[PDB]
Paper text:
As a next step to assess interactions between GE and rifamycins, we sought to determine crystal structures of RPo bound simultaneously to GE and a rifamycin. In a second effort, noting that steric clash may be limited to the dmaDap sidechain of GE and the C3 atom and sidechain of Rif, we soaked crystals of RPo with GE and rifamycin SV (RifSV), a Rif analog that lacks the C3 sidechain and that retains high RNAP-inhibitory and antibacterial potency. In this case, the resulting electron density maps showed unambiguous electron density for GE in the GE target and for RifSV in the Rif target. Occupancy levels for both GE and RifSV were 1, indicating that GE and RifSV were bound simultaneously to RNAP in the crystal. The inability to obtain a structure with simultaneously bound ligands upon crystal soaking with GE and Rif, but ability to obtain a structure with simultaneously bound ligands upon crystal soaking with GE and RifSV, highlights the contribution of the rifamycin C3 region to steric clash between GE and rifamycins. The conformation of the GE dmaDap residue differs in RPo-GE and RPo-GE-RifSV. The GE dmaDap sidechain in RPo-GE-RifSV is rotated by ∼110°, in a direction that increases the distance between the dmaDap sidechain carbonyl carbon and the RifSV C3 atom from 3.7 Å to 8.6 Å and thereby alleviates steric clash. This observation highlights the contribution of the GE dmaDap residue to steric clash between GE and rifamycins. The crystal structure of RPo-GE-RifSV immediately suggests the possibility of constructing a bipartite compound comprising GE, linked through its dmaDap residue, to a rifamycin, linked through its C3 or O4 atom. Accordingly, synthesis of such a bipartite compound not only is possible, but also is tractable. Such a bipartite compound is expected to be able to bind simultaneously to the GE target (through the GE moiety) and the Rif target (through the rifamycin moiety).
Author numbering:
A (entry chain D): 1210 to 1238, 1254 to 1262
B (entry chain D): 632 to 789
C (entry chain D): 1420 to 1502
D (entry chain D): 947 to 1104
E (entry chain E): 2 to 95
F (entry chain I): 1 to 7
G (entry chain C): 1 to 56, 63 to 1118
H (entry chain B): 2 to 228
DNA sequence: TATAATGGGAGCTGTCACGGATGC
DNA sequence: GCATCCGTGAGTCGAG
């Protein structure tokens, strides 16, 4: 987001989950079922 | 509803909404001036709508100055589902949103609704202003690419 | 051992998180038998208790930071120079 | 910038590409008549033919726009990235294209009408299968997506 | 965007540290009635009212500007808490 | 009734 | 104005009565107008016939029934919160076998709700529509086995809750297994129970691939039907003693009992047609001459093995086929519940026959109506198929009545619903609409009956087709089931005709849904009309062929949400269906026969007919609908006017001169405007609010009860403690607000005073009481006040009191007061507008008239739409509607362009040419040449290849106008928009999602009981929900204190929230928050689960969060 | 219905003679752009100024020819001549012909123009041309009073057969940009705030420029007087 | 003190009896007339507390 | 407070997508 | 070792 070193204390996990999850509704039903499969 | 005029960091906030949201602060700033003897008087004064007067609006304007609120549109898919905006009192019951943040909320003008939250303490307000301010996050925490960028009419005109 | 996200979630150390996730009876019984303690390492736990999460402004790293002006700093400096 | 019905420009090339296609169809038909091609073979060949034809008339629309009408609104909005993609624009000025049966199998007879010329009832009803399937997809996938997001959050949250 | 936000993000090793600094400073200013400000009268943030310009009531704005002026010292374990409290109370009554 | 708000 | 119609398609038959599904279903069920001896066996008659006679010995028997007259009329029922219903009386006779004593009596069975004229119901005062249900038709099906490719599954399905499904499958081991109540057992056994012997099955099933040998078992034929029966009873009933008569009774109840196991008449016919046999009863077998006889199982097994072998003339079944799916209408559902209630009544009757005086008993003393009443009432009040009426506009009700739901009892459950169920089947053609459905979870599960579609007596949907003999199209129409439709070759409705003869060599037709090009010699039937393919909503979208199916869906749905406007107009471009919709919804008032109009009043219309009789028609005026929209009729005629049969008298809600009015026709320009229409937002002219376009009346009901308490009575009074005359100004003597007073939030609608709860005064209160020397009053002010954001003018007050004539309330309640408040809503920023083509948006800006883009003659436009909304969505219908709308603007005429047969481009161009003449030639005659700005714009358009270079300015302006574009001046500048813009009249509706309803905010307010968290909902003045995902958001931002505020200070930390509020109003920063109460509740709940939750320190030494209050 | 209106306060912010900002608030609804657009048109188009219409250079046949001994081509010198800001001190003077003669290793600035009666050169340090050893520059430039912008092909004026017509930029105003922001007086939030920005060449100041602009407009309002 | 940990374990019958402020010997909730808690009932003020 | 009376009914049906436990 | 059974999951705010 800031195009620079990550600040210590930034919560990475939630950011990762959100980043993976948001586009998810743009995938169909190899699409979403393949992702869930993985 | 889209404000075109808003700076990236701003949002149109209906007067009545802001009055109710900020109400304790407004009572306090009403006792700070000569508008009311005390808190309870000010509250009883605001209770009825026909008891509302000119000075109280300028008072509210003083109250909210420098402060920000939080706009959130369901579903919140990623971090930017909530963003911090400096409120600007507007006529009408509608919240005005800045165009560039639309893509981030996946919001459009076909009747989407948004929620307003008011951070209370100095800490919460500081977090909102520095960390969550719309103008402060310009890029996708996901792809790294620009998040708030020209779209629709803007790209068209340019 | 490679396990999928759900099992890995349920398999975590914090029983508050696991109990909030899924299979509440199972998690809670296995936690109660072994008399588990939750150290509140993660976010969900402290969220449930309503504490300040261990991230951002609530990270031990940046949260103990102090701020003082030069005037007061020098006054306290003189207070330290006296003793 | 506006949109009139004449702003969707049906290229002449279309007609040519259609007639030629028909001719080829007949050829393939003859190939089925004497037993050179099986049922599934003929089906596949027809599908391929119509796919390539659709592609061709898309390229025809866009070439016509680029050379003859560079400022045509559909073309502008498409190229700038403000609105629309080649397939949609093709449906507007070109042919609508191949359609799917409820089973997922494709009909041998494509809609030859643009939205400009307008569809015929049988064409419309044929397309409604696809529309319904797509809409149901969109409505159903939100839940599973959400579920996935939640699982991910719960596994990564610490 | 908050004025000179880039400089502020430059000052600190982590953005959240900047946040904590500003919040704490703002609480100090609120508690001591702004008397402890490191800003000269001409540097005071101004809210423009119906009558004319006045002092900006917002503590966070002040704290960010003070921070920008480099007139503040931020860090861990500078002074014992009760000592700082008592001293700030001494110089600036409340 | 759902999607982007037909009903 | 002249209405010009287009299209060459001649409709042979008009649209059937649209509510006929509802009205005819229910009428068929009741037979209230049929004399008892003439009643067919159907509906409640059939229910009585099933239940009776009752035995065990006394015998209670059925003769006939009768339905009386409603104790109260419909309107009165609506006002008194009653149910519109008729009494049900039943003639019965008790018979003692031995004594021969016969006692005949008419017993009162309670009440049955009556369907109103429009095909709705009134239940407990509320208008409710019973929605017809789609399900799997009873019968016998054969479907491919998912696991074993070569094999198949046979299924025998009866009516819902009419008994169990049965599965015949050929097992891997070779034996044929039957599944009932989730029990697999060899079919051979049952075949032996039916009385079959090895010889019979050998000669019947022998012709096959030796699957029959799997049905061959020596141990089975080694035991007689009795022994086999007891064997089967031991198999299906573990632990239950295998008595002979109990086994016969159970197996008979499972198979041959009509009172328990019932196929439909549909299941009957279908089984007959499928298996190629003839059924006597509706069961699978019989009990005759002491033994069991087989109607079904052997033909079924035969067909099964015949499908397995590959024998020609045997095929699987499509369960999505509309020949295999049927509709249970209102009558069938109501009858089902009636049958259940009757069964309960019979159980009670037998139970009452066993004990009690055996000499003196009457049908009155045996029969208790309670279970039947509770059954019917349960159905009408609590059934998922009984729905609160959609009253928004008349089209809403009409569409609601035509709804087909796959949900409800015996129906599907979503989240269990797959794609195959939601798909559009090929057999949906002409029957169920391919377009109109929801976008969300319910998509494909809820659908709409097609315009020409009908439901037969068997419950299958049928569509009309014209007979075609030897290329000659007759006027003979035949309604077909999907199964019957599959048998023919059906030509399309747009195919050319000269007279009654087909004029094309190659005609487009359908065979089993598959499109095929045939010769007129081959055409058996032909489509009645394109109209039949879609629903009523979909049929209201002009230029539909130019719209993508999805946006068509959106517009179709959105019309239902159109709010009735005071000025509402019919669309400039209609489909020709605008009138029938109003006529059938019974919104508008019409003339019964030819005659002269005697009187015209705002409240009434008096008419003298040819019969010489004076018929007076009262008008419903400003009634509140279920959705709060104002439904009122206005008279369209005048004194003395001659009127034929069917002429319009009063104009219903959302109706203009008999035409359906869902909105306004406004003059639109499609151009981007300063980012105000950005992303589907809409900009409107203030001239729309000035002339009251898009203005609607809305009525809201407020209700308050004064009851008796153990602390003393509540009472409605004008005497309210601690209130001024200023606050009591608009209150009358009794304490009720006066009619016509303007009420704003905070005002008192109805005064009320309740005796205070027993109150120990806090010391501060006592001291202050001593200081001011005032008695603390015994009663406090509970008065009903206008909620926040509400308010309007008070148009009605209803007061009911216990001890008043005809008035009795629920026990304990002294009096009920109702206040009706009507408000007149103009259009405002945040309100939702939409067209019929699926373009929807919120008004984002209301510009003053001078800012609005205008024509050269000074005419401003009402609405500025964004062009960007068109291409991605692919709905071009709005464009054409706009062009033809421009023509109609300058020619002063409206049009009718039916779907798929309508105004095409050239004709629109001609009309636009004439329009150009009116728009320009006048100007030339007025002595004004071409403007400089028009020159600049013409240079621009010339560069755009829009106009042919070298022509005169007039010629090029005509060239543009023909393309539907005009020169436009920006009102702020006066300079022209560089290009020509598309301008024209468009029909836009105001949807019922209005910002005035949706806006809410709260600082502090009520909290929940157990959770101690803020209540939900605007009505409760509650807070917004901050959920798991919002929490994740805050976490990702790493704002810790904000999150902690949400979790603690803002909600459910008691001490924390109180302290925070006190601090803020004091001017102090908010305190450190403490433990949220809901965690304490969690801890205590876990303790109640016998689990110990200890909050420790790092020393593993307990920390008490309850602060000692929980520890002895 | 009953209306009250306070006379707006005119706010001026000026940096030198080259620039200024002009704020008029509060204004009645719509009146932001009502005053704004006309003044813009009037400022750019009609404000009196001076420009170089024609230029003659010895041994130079046409505009795209090159000058031996000088690095810039004729075109680049014409451009530099377009940026020359010349002020007429005498209101009587409608036109001037400025002569310049130079050679050798020297860079000619606007100072080198031989002074003329009541003619002030605002930008004497402006670069015209650089000459090397053996290079010669003999030129005469025609400066006329006028208004707005006239292309060379439009006036087509020549004193000499080899004289080249130059696009004449008369306007002392380089740019006008105006914006209307919503501001509030007491209860009403829509009241217009007009912010005006004007660029000049220094010959006429922005404040002077705007005052001239409102005068032109006001005089035109008197044209509705006598039929 | 500050809460740094949360422990969960099976509660002993003795611990359960330790938590309890009394035994509920009656199914009763509140009285049909006085609308106040009964004695030894689920809502009894003797055990759980003053209203 | 006493003729004698001695084994209950309703199920409820178009989801997979499975996870680990249990069974020839 | 591989079919089979039982329990537990199946998006968010809004109004209701
Ligand atoms: C009593 O039924 C309730 C739920 C039962 O549960 C469930 C499980 O079974 C059904 C059945 C049998 C249906 O057919 C539903 C249905 O068709 C829906 C939405 C549902 O969720 C339905 C539900 C269920 O959710 N979509 C529509 O109807 C759309 C296409 C048009 C009409 C919209 C208006 C706004 C409504 O008509 C409204 C006036 C009101 O009538 C209903 C909201 C009703 O609420 C009440 C107070 O009556 C619901 C249906
Ligand atoms: Mg939307």
């Amino acid at each position: 987001s800031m195009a620079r070193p990550v600040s210590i204390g930034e919560a990475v996990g939630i950011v990762a989950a959100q980043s993976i999850g948001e586009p998810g509704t743009q995938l169909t039903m190899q699409g979403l079922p393949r992702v869930i499969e993985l | 509803v889209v404000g075109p005029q808003l700076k990236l960091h701003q949002c149109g906030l209906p007067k009545r909404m802001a009055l109710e949201l900020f109400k304790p602060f407004l009572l306090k700033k009403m006792e700070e001036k000569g508008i009311a003897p005390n808190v309870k008087a000010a509250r009883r004064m605001l209770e009825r709508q026909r008891d509302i007067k000119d000075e109280v609006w300028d008072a509210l304007e003083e109250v909210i100055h420098g402060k920000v609120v939080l706009l959130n549109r369901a579903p919140t898919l990623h971090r930017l589902g909530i963003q911090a905006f400096q409120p600007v009192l507007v006529e009408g019951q509608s919240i005005q949103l800045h165009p560039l943040v639309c893509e981030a909320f996946n919001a459009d003008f076909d009747g989407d609704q948004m929620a307003v939250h008011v951070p209370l303490s100095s800490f919460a307000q500081a977090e909102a202003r520095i960390q969550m301010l719309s103008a402060h996050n310009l890029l996708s925490p996901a792809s790294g690419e620009p998040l708030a960028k020209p779209s629709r009419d803007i790209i068209l005109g340019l | 051992l490679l396990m999928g996200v759900t099992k890995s979630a349920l398999s975590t150390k914090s029983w508050l998180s696991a109990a909030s996730f899924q299979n509440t009876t199972h998690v809670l019984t296995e936690a109660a038998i072994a008399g588990k303690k939750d150290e509140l390492i993660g976010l969900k736990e402290n969220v449930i208790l309503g504490r300040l999460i261990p991230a951002g402004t609530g990270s031990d790293f940046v949260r103990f930071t102090q701020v003082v002006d030069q005037k007061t700093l020098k006054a306290i400096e003189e207070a330290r120079k006296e003793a | 910038i506006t949109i009139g019905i004449d702003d969707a420009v049906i290229p002449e090339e279309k007609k040519q590409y259609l007639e030629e296609a028909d001719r080829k169809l007949l050829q393939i038909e003859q190939a089925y008549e004497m037993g050179f091609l099986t049922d599934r073979e003929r089906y596949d060949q027809i599908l391929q033919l119509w796919t390539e034809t659709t592609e061709k008339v898309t390229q025809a629309v866009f070439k016509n726009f680029e050379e003859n009408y560079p400022f045509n609104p559909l073309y502008v909005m498409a190229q700038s990235g403000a609105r629309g993609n080649p397939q949609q624009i093709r449906q507007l000025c070109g042919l609508r294209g191949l359609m799917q049966k409820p089973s997922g199998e494709t009909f041998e007879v494509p809609v030859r009408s643009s939205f400009r010329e307008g569809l015929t009832v049988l064409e419309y009803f044929i397309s409604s299968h696809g529309a319904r399937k797509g809409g149901a997809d969109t409505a159903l996938r939100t839940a599973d997506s959400g579920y996935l997001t939640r699982k991910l959050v719960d596994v990564t949250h610490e | 965007a908050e004025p000179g936000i880039d400089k502020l993000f430059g000052m600190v090793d982590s953005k959240y540290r900047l946040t904590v600094v500003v919040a704490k400073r703002a609480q100090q200013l609120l508690r001591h009635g702004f008397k402890n400000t490191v800003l000269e009268p001409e540097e005071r943030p101004k809210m423009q009212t119906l009558e004319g310009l006045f002092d900006d009531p917002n503590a966070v704005t002040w704290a960010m500007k003070e921070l920008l002026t480099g007139r503040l010292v931020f860090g861990e374990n500078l002074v014992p808490e009760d000592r700082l409290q008592k001293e700030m109370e001494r110089l600036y009554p409340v | 009734a759902x999607x982007x708000x037909x009903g | 104005m002249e209405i010009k119609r287009f299209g060459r398609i001649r409709e042979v038959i008009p649209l059937p009565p649209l509510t006929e599904i509802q009205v005819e279903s229910y009428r068929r069920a009741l037979q209230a107008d049929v004399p008892p001896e003439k009643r067919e066996n159907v509906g409640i008659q059939a229910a009585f016939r099933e239940t009776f006679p009752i035995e065990e010995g006394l015998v209670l028997d059925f003769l006939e029934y009768r339905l009386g007259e409603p104790p109260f009329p419909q309107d009165e029922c609506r006002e008194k919160d009653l149910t519109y219903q008729a009494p049900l009386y039943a003639r019965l006779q008790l018979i003692h076998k031995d004594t021969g004593l016969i006692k005949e009596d008419e017993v009162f069975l309670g009440h049955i709700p009556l369907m109103t004229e429009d095909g709705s119901f009134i239940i407990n005062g509320a208008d409710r529509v019973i929605v017809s249900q789609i399900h799997r038709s009873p019968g016998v099906y054969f479907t491919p086995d998912p696991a074993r490719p070569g094999r198949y599954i046979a299924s025998i399905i009866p009516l819902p809750k009419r008994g169990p499904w049965i599965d015949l499958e050929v097992e891997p081991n070779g034996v044929v297994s039957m599944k009932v109540n989730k029990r697999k057992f060899p079919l051979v056994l049952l075949l032996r129970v039916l009385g079959y012997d090895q010889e019979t099955l050998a000669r019947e099933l022998g012709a096959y691939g030796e699957l029959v040998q799997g049905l061959m078992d020596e141990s089975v034929f080694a035991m007689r039907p009795e022994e086999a029966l007891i064997r089967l009873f031991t198999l299906l009933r573990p632990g239950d003693p295998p008595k002979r008569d109990k086994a016969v009774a159970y197996v008979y109840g499972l198979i041959a009992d009509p009172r328990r196991y019932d196929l439909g008449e549909a299941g009957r016919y279908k089984a007959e047609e499928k298996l190629g046999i003839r059924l006597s009863g509706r069961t699978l077998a019989r009990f005759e001459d002491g033994e069991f006889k087989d109607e079904v199982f052997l033909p079924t097994l035969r067909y099964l093995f015949a499908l397995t072998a590959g024998v020609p003339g045997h095929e699987v079944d499509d369960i999505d086929h509309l020949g295999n799916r049927r509709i249970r209408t209102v009558g069938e559902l109501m009858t089902d519940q009636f049958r259940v209630g009757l069964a309960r009544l019979a159980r009670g009757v037998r139970e009452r026959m066993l004990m009690g005086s055996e000499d003196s008993l009457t049908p009155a003393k045996l029969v208790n109506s309670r279970p039947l009443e509770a059954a019917i009432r349960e159905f009408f009040s609590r059934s998922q198929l009984s729905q609160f009426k959609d009253e928004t506009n008349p089209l809403s009700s009409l569409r609601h009545k035509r709804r087909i739901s796959a949900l409800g009892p015996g129906g599907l459950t979503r989240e269990r619903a797959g794609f195959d169920v939601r798909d559009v089947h090929r057999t949906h053609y002409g029957r169920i609409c391919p377009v109109e459905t929801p976008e969300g979870a319910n998509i494909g599960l809820i659908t709409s009956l097609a315009a020409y579609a009908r439901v037969d007596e068997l419950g299958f949907i049928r569509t009309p087709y014209r007979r075609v003999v030897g290329g000659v199209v007759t006027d003979e129409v035949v309604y077909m089931t999907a199964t019957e439709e599959d048998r023919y070759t059906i030509a399309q409705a747009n195919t050319p005709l000269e007279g009654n003869r087909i004029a094309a060599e190659r005609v487009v037709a359908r065979r089993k849904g598959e499109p095929v090009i045939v010769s007129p010699e081959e055409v058996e039937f032909m489509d009645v009309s394109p109209k039949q393919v879609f629903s009523v909503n979909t049929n209201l979208i002009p230029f539909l062929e130019h719209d993508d199916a999805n946006r068509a869906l959106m517009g179709s749905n959105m019309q239902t949400q159109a709010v009735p406007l005071i000025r509402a107009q019919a669309p400039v471009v209609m489909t020709g269906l605008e009138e029938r919709v109003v006529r059938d919804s019974l919104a508008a008032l019409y003339a019964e026969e030819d005659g002269e109009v005697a009187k015209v009043d705002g409240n009434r219309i008096v008419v003298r007919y040819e019969d010489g009789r004076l018929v007076e028609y009262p008008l419903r005026r400003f009634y509140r609908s279920n959705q709060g929209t104002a439904l009122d009729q206005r008279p369209r005629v005048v004194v003395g006017q001659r009127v034929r049969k069917g002429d319009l008298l009063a104009d219903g809600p959302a109706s203009e001169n008999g035409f359906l009015a869902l909105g306004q026709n406004v003059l639109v320009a499609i151009m981007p405007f300063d980012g105000y229409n950005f992303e589907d937002a809409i900009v409107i002219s203030e001239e729309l609010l000035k002339r009251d376009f898009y203005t609607s009346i809305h009525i809201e009901r407020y209700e308050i009860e004064a009851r008796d308490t153990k602390l003393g009575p509540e009472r409605i009074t004008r005497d309210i403690p601690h209130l001024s005359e200023a606050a009591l100004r608009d209150l009358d003597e009794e304490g009720v607000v006066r009619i016509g007073a303007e009420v704003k939030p905070g005002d008192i609608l109805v005064g009320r005073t309740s005796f205070k709860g027993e109150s120990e005064p806090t010391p501060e209160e006592r001291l202050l009481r001593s200081i001011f020397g005032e008695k603390a009053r015994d009663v406090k002010d509970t008065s009903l006040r206008v909620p926040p954001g509400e308010g309007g003018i008070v148009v009605r007050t209803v007061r009911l009191r216990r001890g008043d004539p005809g008035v009795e309330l629920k026990p304990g309640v002294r009096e009920v007061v109702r206040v009706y408040v009507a408000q007149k809503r103009k259009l405002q920023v945040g309100d939702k507008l939409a067209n019929r083509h699926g373009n929807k948006g919120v008004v984002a800006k209301i510009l003053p008239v001078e800012d609005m883009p205008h024509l050269p003659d000074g005419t401003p436009v009402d609405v500025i739409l964004n062009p960007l909304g068109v291409p991605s969505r692919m709905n071009l219908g709005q464009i054409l509607e706009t062009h033809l709308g421009l023509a109609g603007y300058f020619l002063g005429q409206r049009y009718i362009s039916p779907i798929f047969d309508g105004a095409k481009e050239p004709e629109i161009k001609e009309l636009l040419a004439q329009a150009f003449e009116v728009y320009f030639g006048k100007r030339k005659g007025e002595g004004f040449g071409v403007d400089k700005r028009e020159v600049e714009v013409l240079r621009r358009a010339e560069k755009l290849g829009l106009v042919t270079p070298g022509k005169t300015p007039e010629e090029q302006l005509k060239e543009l106008f023909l393309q539907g574009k005009v020169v436009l001046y920006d009102g702020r500048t006066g300079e022209p928009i560089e290009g020509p813009i598309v301008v024209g009249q468009m029909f836009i509706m105001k949807l019922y999602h209005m910002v005035e309803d949706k806006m809410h905010a709260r600082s502090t307010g009520p909290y929940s009981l157990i959770t101690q968290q803020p209540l939900g909902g605007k009505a409760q003045f509650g807070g917004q929900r901050f959920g798991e995902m919002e929490v994740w958001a805050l976490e990702a931002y790493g704002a810790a204190h904000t999150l902690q505020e949400m979790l603690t200070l803002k909600s459910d930390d008691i001490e924390g929230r109180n302290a925070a509020y006190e601090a803020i109003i004091k001017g102090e920063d908010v305190p450190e928050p403490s433990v949220p109460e809901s965690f304490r509740v969690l801890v205590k709940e876990l303790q109640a689960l016998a689990l110990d939750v200890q909050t420790l320190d790092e020393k593993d030494n307990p920390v008490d969060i309850f602060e000692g209050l929980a520890s002895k | 219905l009953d209306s009250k209106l306070k006379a707006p306060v005119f706010t001026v912010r000026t940096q030198g003679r080259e620039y200024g900002e002009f704020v008029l608030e509060p204004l009645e609804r719509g009146f932001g752009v009502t005053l704004g657009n006309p003044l813009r048109r009037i400022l750019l188009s009609s404000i009196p100024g001076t420009a170089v219409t024609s230029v003659y250079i010895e041994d130079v046949l046409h505009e795209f020819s090159t000058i031996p001994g000088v690095k810039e081509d004729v075109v680049e010198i014409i451009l530099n001549l377009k940026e020359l800001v010349v002020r007429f001190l005498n209101p009587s003077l409608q036109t001037v012909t400025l002569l310049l003669k130079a050679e050798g290793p020297k860079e000619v600035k606007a100072r080198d123009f031989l002074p003329v009666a009541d003619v002030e050169i605002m930008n004497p340090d402006l670069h015209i041309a650089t000459l090397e050893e053996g290079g010669r520059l003999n030129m005469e430039v025609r400066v006329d009073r006028g208004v707005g912008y006239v292309p060379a092909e439009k006036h087509g004026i020549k004193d000499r057969i080899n004289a080249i017509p130059v696009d004449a930029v008369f306007s002392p105003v380089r740019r006008v940009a105006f914006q209307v922001e919503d501001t509030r007086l007491g209860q009403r939030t829509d009241l217009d705030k007009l912010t005006l920005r004007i660029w000049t060449d220094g010959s006429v100041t922005p404040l002077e420029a705007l005052n001239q602009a409102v005068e032109i407009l006001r005089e035109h309002l008197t044209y509705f007087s006598n039929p | 003190k500050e809460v740094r940990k949360v422990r969960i374990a099976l509660a002993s019958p003795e611990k359960i009896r330790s938590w309890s402020y009394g035994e509920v010997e009656k199914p009763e909730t509140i009285n049909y007339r006085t609308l106040k808690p009964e004695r030894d009932g689920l809502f009894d003020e003797r055990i759980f507390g003053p209203i």
